[PDB]
C-alpha cells in the first residue's frame, strides 16, 4: 500500500514552523571561550521569546539535546527553564543522537503534539568546544571508589599505594566510536578512495559553499534568523560569523597537507568543517494553533525519515539511506524539490552521496528500492553554502538549515525543501519541508 | 582455457606489471609441474620489454593467493631423481626471478602456506591484507617433507636464525598482526587498497639498499650456532623420540645454508627430498593427510540435513559445560543449559570461565568480543525456553529408566522438530529410545575426555534413525573442529572397545612384577602419546571400566582386567587426578618435574616376578590387542568404511601418526608376516593372542586390505 | 470526545503489551556489589527475547534510561544492543527521568509507535546502588582543565600552589535537590504532618505491603516476573529477593528511632522502602503487529497522564494531580476499575494521597475539576504488598508494577488497572491498564 505520512494531528491540523533562530557561530578559543553549553541554550531562549512575542507559560514542552554535555549538568532543558523566564510547569525533558540531536528534537517533539499529551512545543540545541569535561584515568577513578568505601585510617594508606605518575596525567578529549575507533575523518577519506573522489572537486565545493555563504551574509539573506550574541565581559558584539573565510582562493586550498591520511588523503581543512560553537531555537506549533493566537506559520512539516547503517565502513551514507524514505513518507520525489539541503561534514562525503543519490546500482541493492532516488541540482544544491563556512556546532547543525531553508523557500515559491544530515554510528536523518 | 594456467600477465598505463592467478579447476591455488614452465615462458616475455619498473602479483581469487604444492604430485614421485630434479628445477625458478634488477612486489591475501611463501621470499617486497584469513607458514614437516627450496637458508638470512627454525619445525601459524613485528612483510595494509598499497612500494628506487638489522645479532655467526643446534638438536630428538624422520635433517639443512652459503643449502635440501620425499613415514603423514580430509569432505549421510540454530543441553556439571562451550564459543550457537541443581550449571558456567578468558591473560584478544561469547550460553533450571531448541544433548547419568524417562518427557515437553542426541557410555541407542513416540531423529554421540583436547566424536544411530539425523550429527561435528565417523550401534562402540583389551593388557602386564617406568618409556617411544596408567586415570577410571563388563557381556572374556587389584584401586579413594590421589604424585612438588609414582601402589599390587618381557615386547604386544580388536570390531564392519577406521584409531587414541594407522601398520610389516608372530604369543601366554578369521583368511593367502591402486 | 481519547493507532489498532520481565531486587551490599547498571539491562534483555518466539531482529527501536547514571558510555541504550545479541539496526534512544525513567521510556515508546515508523519495541530500565560515581570537587575541575591546557612546566607548578585546604576529599552522594534542597524524606514527613498521620496510622501499610507480597512469593503468583539472577562470580544464584522480611511483627519495628527529624519523625527506616538494585523488561508492539506473528498480548494499553507541581512543598502529590487526567483521557471512572497500584516510596504520603483522592477539597481548589476522583477499597489497593518489601530501584520500579498488574487482572480475568508514582521536582505519572 501507499506508505505515506502527511504530518497531520488528531484534528487533521498539520504540523507547522511558526519560527525559528540561530545564534551566530564562532571558532574555538575565540569569543566563545570558557563558556558551558548551558548558558548558550539560555541565552538563545531567552531572546527568542521576546522576538516572538508570545507568551512563556503557552507552551507545553522543551527538549534540548546536545553533544559533549557536562555531567555537573545531566538533564539540561530543565536547568533551561531554571535559568530563563520559561513557565516552571513546562514538562521539558533533553535528548541525545549524535549530531542529529535537533532532528531527534524536532522529531520526538513534533510527535509529542501529535498525540495531545501537550499542545505546544519548541526544539533546538547547543554545544561548545571551548570547555571540555575532562576525566580523569578510569583506574585513578577507580583508586578513588575504593578509598571513599574504606573505614579505617590505616587503610586508607595502603589503597592509595597502586599509585604512578602515568596515572596523573587527564584524559584528552576523543572522537573515535567507542566499538570502533575510526575517525570521521577516516570515515570521509574510505569514501574518497573508495568511490572516488579528487580533491579539485572536493575542494570546489568548500571554495563554492565558502562563496556562496559569503555572497549571502553580504546580501543580508540570512540576518533575520542570526541574532548578535552577547558576551558577560561586553567587550565586543559578534554578528557575523568568523569562521567563514571570504577572500580564499582554489590555489590556496590546494596547498595544504593532508590532516588524516598525509599518505593519500583527500582531505584537507579547506573542505572539511572546523570547531565551532553555537546554539538555534525554533518553536513548532501546530496548524490549529498557530492561528488561534495570531502567527503565520513560517513553513510546516510534511514527513521525516531515519535510516541506520553499518558502523565499520560507509559510515556517512545516511543521506543515501533515509532520503528514498521521507520522499515515500511524504509521496513526494526529487523532480519537484525547490530546494535541497544536505550536511556537508566532508567534501568527499558529499560527492559521494549525491554520487550515490545518483547510483541507480546503489538504491536497487543497498536500499532494495526499485529505481535510484534522483538527481541533485547544483543550482539548488546548498544556494547559501553548507556546513563547510558556518561550522559544525554539533546541536545547532540541525536547526541551523531548517531556518535558512524555510526562509529561503520563503523567498521563493512554495515548493519542498529537504534537509538530510550523516551522523556518527551509522545514522541518518532526513525529511521533507513544506514553506506552502 | 587450460593454457592460460593461471599465470596472467596485465600491465597498466604506468609502467608496471599485475600478475593475477586464477586457476581454472578447484578454487585453492596450487602448483603443479606445467606452471613452472609457462611463468618462465611469462617473465621471458617480460625480460625482453625494457619500459617496465616493477611487477605486483594479485590473487585475483577471494579464496586463497597460493594454497602450495599439490600432494598428489609429490606422490608420484618414484625414486630419488624426481624429488631432486623437482627440486633442482625449483632452485632455478626463483634464482631466475631473484636475478632481477627491477623491483618484485608480492600483495598476499587469502591463504599463503608451503609453496606459497616460496614466491613471498622469491620477491624483494610484500604486502599483506589485514583481512584474518590471511596467513603464512611451512606445513611441510607435517606431511614428512620439509620446504622445498630456499625456506632453510635464505629465511633464517631474512628473518632470524632463531625466529626462522621453530616455524619449519613447529609448523605454527603466524598472523597478520604478528608478521609485520617480526619484519617477515614490510607493510600491512588493508585488503581494499591491497593493490594500490602495492603500487607505489613497486616504484621505489632501492630494491635492496638498506637492510633491517637484527635485534638478535648476537649469536649471529659460528660462536652460538653450534651451540643452538646441539641443544635444540638435543631438545628436538627429546621431543621427537628419534621415531620421526626431518627433524635433525632440518637443522642440518639449516646448518649448512647459513655456515658456508645458500647454495649448499639448495643440494643438501634437494639431497633431503632424494630420501624424505620417499620415506614410510612421509607416505604414511602423506596417506592420513588424504584419508582425514576425505572424511572432513565426507557428508556421513545422504539426505539433506534440516535446519539447527538453538541448542540445549540437559546437565551441566564439567562434561556437560564441556558441549556448550564448543557450541557456543567455538560454532557461534546460543545453547541453552537445564540441570536440577543450579550448581550443576554453576560448575559448567564457571567452569567455561576457567577455560575462557586465559587468552585474555595472554593478550591473544580482547573483553569486547568475550561478553559474546557468554552471551550464548545461557542456563536454566526448567523446560521453559526450550520449545525453540532445534537439538538437544544428554549429559546426565546412563541409567536406561532415567534416559527413558526423561527422552519421553523431552519429547513431550518441546516441539517435534527436535531431534535427540545422548552421549551413552555403554547402553544401546536403541534400547535408549524403546518407548519413543519419535524414534526416527534419535541419535547418539559420544564424547570424551574434555573435548577442547579430544579432537573427534562419534555419530552412533540405533536401528530407526533418519538419513536427516546423521546428516545433522555427522555435520554438528565438522563445525566444531571434530572428526565424524558413523559406527554401528554395538556395545563397547569402535574407540571404547579396542581401548579394553589395550587397559586389560597392562594391568595384567602390570601385576606380574614389572616396574611400570621402564615399561611406559617403552610404549610411549614406540610412537604412542601417553602412557597406559596416566591416561587411564585422568580420562575417569570408573567411566572407562563401566565398558568393560559391557565388554564381557558382549563378546567374550578377553576384556577382563585381573580381579581384586584393579577393583581394589576403585575402593581405596585412589581414582586418579579428579580424586587428588592416584599412580604418579599429582601435587608437583618436585618444582613441577617429573614426578616418580606413588610408593605405595606396589604393595597393593601382586608384583611377583620380575621384568621378564623385553621393551619392544611389550610395546607391540600392546598393538597387537588394539589391532587384533580392530580386525575383530570392523570384521562385522563396525566401521563404515576402512578409511574411517584408520581416522577412528590413529587420530583418536594416538597410533604413531609415522606409522600412518591400524591397517597402514598391517600391511607394512609384510601382510599375513604378524599372523604368524602372534600365534606364537597365544602359546606363550594365553588364548587372548588367537588370530582373528578374516586375519587368518589373509594371513594364510596373502591379502592386504587396501587394494587402492597397489 | 472533549476527554476521552482512544489509545488506537492510524491502522486501527490498539496499543498492545506483551508479558514482561523484571529482575529480582537485592540490597547494595547483600548482592549486585561492586556491579555496573550496564549488565543489569543486558542481563534481562539476553534473556527476554530467548524465551518466547519472536527474534531479536523484528524490534527497530529500543529506549532505556537509568535514574543512576555512568558518565562512561552516557547513552545506556547504544551498549545493550551492542553487548547482548540484537540488531545492528536498531533505533537506540535513552532517556533520563527520576523515579518514572520507565515510566516516561514506555510513554516514549508508545507515541512513536503509533507514527507508523515504529511497530515493536522494548521498554525498561537498569538501576544500581552499589557503583555509585563519586565525582570530585569542583575546585578540582577547573585545576585539571587548567593544567590540561598549561603549556610550559612552569605554568604547571603554578596552578597547583592553590591546590590545598579539605579539596583531596572526594564528595559523597546526596539526594538534596538541585534548586530546592530537599531530602525527599524531610518533605515526606511535613507531608505526614501537615494532612496529620500518625505512625500506628502508617506502619500497617508496610505491614500489609510486607504481608501479600512474601505470601506472593510463597504462592508463587509472580514467579514468571521474576528472573533467577546469575553472578559473574558464579558463587550461588538468587532466586527470592532478600529486601523483604514478611517475619517480623508490627509492634516490633515500631521502636525504631525517627530517620530524618529525629524529634517528630512519624516515619522510620522500617516503614519506607530501602534502596535496591534491579532492572525489568517488557515487549511492546502494536495489536495488528502482535496478531500477524501470533503471539498473545499480556492485555492492553488504554490510556496515560503526566502532572507536574511545583517543588517546594507536598510535591508527591503528582498521583493526587495525574491520576484524575488518566481517567477523563481513558473515559473511566474508579467505580469500574478493577485493581490499583500506588508507588508507596513511604510511609504515610501514600496514605495522605487516599486521603487527597478522597478530599474533595484538593480536586476542587488544585485541580479545577468539579468533582473528586473517588475513593479506593483496600482489597483492590495493592493486592500483592506494594513497594515496602521489594525494593524501589528509581529507574527499574516502573515496569514492574504493569507486569505484575496486567498479570493480577489475568488471574482477575478482566478490569482496567491504574498506576501511578510520585517523582522528584514535584513530578508524576498516572496511567490506565486494560488486559481486555
Not at chain 2, 541453552?336 to 586465559?358: T, V
Not at chain 2, 602419546?529 to 577410571?541: H, K, M, S, Y
Not at chain 2, 565398558?547 to 577382563?560: H, K, Q, T
Not at chain 2, 597387537?624 to 587420530?651: K, P, T
Amino acid at each position: 500500500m501507499g506508505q505515506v505520512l502527511p504530518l497531520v494531528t488528531r484534528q487533521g491540523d498539520r504540523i507547522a514552523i511558526v519560527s525559528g533562530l540561530r545564534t551566530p557561530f564562532a571558532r574555538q578559543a575565540t569569543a566563545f571561550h570558557g563558556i558551558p553549553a548551558v548558558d548558550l541554550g539560555k541565552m538563545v531562549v531567552g531572546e527568542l521569546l521576546a522576538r516572538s512575542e508570545i507568551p512563556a507559560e503557552v507552551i507545553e514542552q522543551l527538549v534540548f539535546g546536545q553533544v559533549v554535555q557536562m555531567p555537573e549538568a545531566p538533564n539540561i532543558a530543565r536547568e533551561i527553564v531554571l535559568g530563563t523566564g520559561m513557565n516552571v510547569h513546562t514538562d521539558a525533558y533533553s535528548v541525545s543522537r549524535a549530531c542529529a540531536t535537533s532532528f531527534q528534537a524536532v522529531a520526538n517533539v513534533a510527535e509529542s503534539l501529535m498525540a495531545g499529551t501537550i499542545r505546544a512545543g519548541i526544539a533546538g540545541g547547543a554545544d561548545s568546544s571551548s570547555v571540555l569535561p575532562i576525566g580523569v584515568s578510569k583506574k585513578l577513578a577507580r583508586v578513588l571508589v575504593d578509598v571513599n568505601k574504606a573505614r579505617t585510617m590505616s587503610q586508607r594508606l595502603k589503597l592509595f599505594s597502586r599509585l604512578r605518575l602515568r596515572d596523573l596525567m587527564p584524559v584528552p578529549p576523543a572522537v573515535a566510536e567507542y566499538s570502533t575507533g575510526l575517525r570521521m575523518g577516516d570515515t570521509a577519506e574510505q569514501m574518497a578512495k573508495t568511490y572516488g573522489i579528487t580533491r579539485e572537486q572536493q575542494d570546489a565545493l568548500a571554495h563554492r559553499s565558502h562563496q556562496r555563504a559569503a555572497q549571502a551574509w553580504s546580501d543580508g539573506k540570512l540576518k533575520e534568523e542570526v541574532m548578535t550574541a552577547f558576551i558577560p565581559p561586553y567587550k565586543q558584539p559578534l554578528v557575523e560569523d568568523n569562521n567563514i573565510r571570504g577572500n580564499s582562493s582554489l590555489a590556496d586550498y590546494a596547498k595544504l597537507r593532508p590532516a588524516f591520511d598525509r599518505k593519500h588523503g583527500t582531505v584537507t581543512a579547506a573542505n572539511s568543517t572546523p570547531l565551532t560553537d553555537g546554539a538555534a531555537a525554533v518553536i513548532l506549533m501546530t496548524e490549529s494553533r498557530a492561528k488561534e493566537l495570531g502567527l503565520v506559520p513560517l513553513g510546516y512539516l510534511r514527513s521525516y525519515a531515519f535510516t541506520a547503517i553499518d558502523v565499520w565502513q560507509d559510515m556517512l551514507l545516511g543521506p543515501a539511506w533515509s532520503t528514498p524514505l521521507a520522499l515515500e513518507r511524504a509521496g513526494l520525489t526529487m523532480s519537484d524539490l525547490t530546494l535541497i539541503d544536505m550536511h556537508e561534514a566532508f567534501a568527499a562525503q558529499t560527492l559521494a552521496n549525491i554520487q550515490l543519490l545518483g547510483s541507480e546500482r546503489f538504491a536497487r541493492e543497498a536500499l532494495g528500492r526499485a529505481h535510484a532516488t534522483g538527481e541533485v541540482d547544483d543550482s539548488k544544491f546548498n544556494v547559501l553554502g553548507g556546513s563547510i563556512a558556518y561550522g559544525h556546532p554539533f546541536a545547532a547543525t540541525g536547526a541551523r538549515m531548517i531556518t535558512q531553508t524555510l526562509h529561503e523557500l520563503r523567498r521563493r515559491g512554495g515548493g519542498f525543501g529537504l534537509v538530510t544530515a550523516c551522523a556518527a554510528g551509522g545514522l541518518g536523518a532526513a525529511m521533507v519541508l513544506e514553506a506552502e | 582455457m587450460e593454457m592460460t594456467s593461471a599465470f596472467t600477465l596485465n600491465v597498466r598505463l604506468d609502467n608496471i606489471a599485475v600478475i593475477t592467478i586464477d586457476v581454472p579447476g578447484e578454487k585453492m591455488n596450487t602448483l603443479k609441474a606445467e606452471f613452472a614452465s609457462q611463468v618462465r615462458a611469462i617473465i621471458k616475455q617480460l625480460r625482453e620489454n625494457k619500459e617496465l619498473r616493477g611487477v605486483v602479483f594479485v590473487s585475483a581469487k577471494p579464496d586463497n593467493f597460493i594454497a602450495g604444492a599439490d600432494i598428489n604430485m609429490i606422490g608420484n614421485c618414484k625414486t630419488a631423481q624426481e624429488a631432486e630434479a623437482l627440486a633442482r628445477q625449483g632452485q632455478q625458478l626463483m634464482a631466475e626471478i631473484h636475478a632481477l634488477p627491477i623491483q618484485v612486489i608480492a600483495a598476499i591475501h587469502g591463504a599463503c602456506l608451503g609453496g606459497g611463501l616460496e614466491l613471498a621470499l622469491a620477491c624483494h617486497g610484500r604486502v599483506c591484507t589485514d583481512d584474518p584469513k590471511t596467513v603464512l607458514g611451512l606445513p611441510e614437516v607435517q606431511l614428512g617433507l620439509l620446504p622445498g627450496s630456499g625456506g632453510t637458508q635464505r629465511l633464517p638470512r631474512l628473518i632470524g636464525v632463531s625466529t626462522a627454525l621453530e616455524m619449519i619445525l613447529t609448523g605454527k601459524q603466524l598472523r597478520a598482526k604478528q608478521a609485520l613485528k617480526l619484519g617477515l612483510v614490510d607493510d600491512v595494509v588493508p585488503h581494499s587498497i591491497l593493490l594500490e598499497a602495492a603500487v607505489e612500494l613497486a616504484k621505489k628506487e632501492r630494491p635492496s639498499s638498506r637492510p633491517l638489522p637484527v635485534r638478535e645479532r648476537i649469536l649471529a655467526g659460528p660462536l652460538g650456532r653450534a651451540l643452538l643446534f646441539k641443544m635444540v638438536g638435543k631438545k628436538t630428538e627429546h621431543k621427537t623420540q628419534g621415531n620421526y624422520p626431518a627433524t635433525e635433517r632440518i637443522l642440518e639443512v639449516v646448518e649448512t645454508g647459513l655456515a658456508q652459503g645458500t647454495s649448499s643449502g639448495y643440494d643438501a635440501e634437494a639431497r633431503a627430498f632424494g630420501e624424505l620425499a620417499m620415506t614410510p613415514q612421509s607416505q604414511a603423514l602423506r596417506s592420513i593427510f588424504f584419508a582425514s580430509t576425505d572424511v572432513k569432505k565426507d557428508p556421513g549421510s545422504d539426505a539433506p540435513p534440516a535446519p539447527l540454530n538453538s541448542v540445549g543441553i540437559l546437565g551441566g556439571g564439567l562434561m556437560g559445560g564441556g558441549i556448550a562451550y564448543v557450541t557456543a564459543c567455538k560454532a557461534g550457537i546460543p545453547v541453552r543449559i537445564k540441570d536440577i541443581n543450579p550448581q550443576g550449571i554453576n560448575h559448567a558456567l564457571k567452569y567455561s570461565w576457567d577455560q575462557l578468558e586465559g587468552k585474555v591473560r595472554r593478550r591473544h584478544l580482547k573483553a569486547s568480543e568475550r561478553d559474546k561469547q557468554l552471551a550464548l550460553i545461557s542456563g536454566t533450571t526448567d523446560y521453559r525456553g526450550f520449545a525453540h531448541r532445534d537439538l538437544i544433548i544428554e549429559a546426565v547419568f546412563e541409567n536406561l529408566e532415567l534416559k527413558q524417562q526423561m527422552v519421553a518427557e523431552v519429547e513431550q515437553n518441546c516441539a517435534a522438530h527436535t531431534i535427540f542426541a545422548s552421549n551413552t557410555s555403554s547402553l544401546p541407542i536403541g534400547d535408549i529410545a524403546a518407548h519413543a513416540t519419535r524414534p526416527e531423529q534419535v541419535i547418539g554421540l559420544h564424547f570424551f575426555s574434555p573435548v577442547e583436547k579430544m579432537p573427534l566424536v562419534e555419530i552412533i544411530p540405533h536401528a530407526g534413525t533418519s538419513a536427516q539425523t546423521i546428516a545433522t550429527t555427522v555435520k554438528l561435528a565438522k563445525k566444531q573442529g571434530k572428526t565424524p565417523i558413523v559406527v554401528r550401534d554395538k556395545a563397547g562402540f569402535y574407540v571404547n572397545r579396542i581401548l579394553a583389551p589395550y587397559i586389560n593388557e597392562a594391568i595384567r602386564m602390570l601385576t606380574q612384577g614389572e616396574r611400570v617406568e621402564h615399561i611406559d618409556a617403552a610404549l610411549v617411544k614406540f610412537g604412542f602419546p601417553v602412557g597406559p596408567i596416566q591416561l587411564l586415570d585422568e580420562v575417569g577410571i570408573d567411566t572407562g571400566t563401566k565398558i568393560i563388563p559391557v565388554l564381557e557381556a558382549a563378546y567374550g572374556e578377553r576384556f577382563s582386567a585381573p580381579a581384586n587389584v584393579v577393583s581394589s584401586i576403585l575402593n581405596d579413594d585412589r581414582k586418579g587426578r579428579k580424586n587428588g590421589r592416584g599412580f604418579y604424585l599429582y601435587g608437583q612438588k618436585g618444582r613441577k618435574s617429573k614426578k616418580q609414582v606413588d610408593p605405595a601402589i606396589y604393595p597393593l599390587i601382586g608384583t611377583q616376578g620380575q621384568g621378564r618381557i623385553s621393551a619392544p615386547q611389550v610395546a607391540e604386544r600392546c598393538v597387537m590387542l588394539m589391532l587384533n580388536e580392530a580386525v575383530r570390531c570392523v570384521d562385522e564392519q563396525v566401521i563404515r568404511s576402512v578409511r574411517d577406521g584408520d581416522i577412528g584409531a590413529v587420530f583418536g587414541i594416538g597410533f604413531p601418526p609415522f606409522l600412518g594407522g591400524p591397517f597402514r601398520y598391517i600391511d607394512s610389516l609384510g601382510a599375513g608376516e604378524v599372523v604368524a608372530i602372534m600365534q606364537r604369543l597365544a602359546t606363550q601366554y594365553g588364548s587372548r593372542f588367537t588370530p582373528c578369521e578374516r586375519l587368518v583368511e589373509m594371513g594364510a593367502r596373502g591379502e592386504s586390505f587396501w587394494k587402492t591402486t597397489a
